[PDB]
Amino acid sequence: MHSLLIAAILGVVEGLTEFLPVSSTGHMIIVGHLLGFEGDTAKTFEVVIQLGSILAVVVMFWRRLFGLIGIHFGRPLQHEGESKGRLTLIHILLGMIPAVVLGLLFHDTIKSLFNPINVMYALVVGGLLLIAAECLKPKEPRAPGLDDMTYRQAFMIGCFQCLALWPGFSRSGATISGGMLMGVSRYAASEFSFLLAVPMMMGATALDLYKSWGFLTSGDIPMFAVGFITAFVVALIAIKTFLQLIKRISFIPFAIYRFIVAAAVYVVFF
Ligand SMILES: CCCCCCCC/C=C\CCCCCCCC(=O)OC[C@H](O)CO
Ligand SMILES: [Hg+2]
């Protein structure tokens, strides 16, 4: 059946691109256009399968995410860093504040930038930001591990997450670029952007799910569930592959890939 085959295709697109710095939103508007699923019911479908990819990080960093809110499961949490420091809830809070303040204050304006021409620009500009972060980052990272991050690095990454409010800019692209520019290693900057995505997008979709709750019906549960679960599986493969891939590879290929995706946005929509 078409409805669930499409739900499985959008699921694998969301699972791969949500946490890769390649703009899940950008890929979603392309494939959604080629599939024909572009109505108000699509925007509500694409926000619930985001919660599927959310749950992937949640599963992958289960013990870590709970330790930040005070729940330690009777075993020492595993240390990722060269110092005696530990990533705290304050690190997450600082990484959220700037984009939250700007997101709330400019909600109506942010929503008016969801054009395909804006997503195209955010794919190119966000790609250029990845290149600048790769070319400007220090030789020796100040925070090689996640637990080596400072309150200042966390806050500066948080300010960089405002760029993610630009539709098509890829929250992971913005936050990982800012991490590398603040002396955070690619691995820890990717880890921190995933962890930051959990409170950001769970509050983001909960926000979207409330304002768009009216569209949900009894018939959406089969489609909305097949995509949710698909985005969960694919993201768990994507995040685990990415974190091992980025240990050896740079972000240059992802930037160039974003330029190719920008070309597709123009071919498909203009
Ligand atoms: C759903 C739409 C499709 C999703 C688009 C995904 C984005 C990936 C694009 C560019 C990254 C290219 C880098 C990944 C390729 C690396 C493969 C590889 O083998 O490189 C490893 C290297 O050998 C180390 O030792
Ligand atoms: Hg350079």
Ligand SMILES: [Hg+2]
């Ligand atoms: Hg900011």
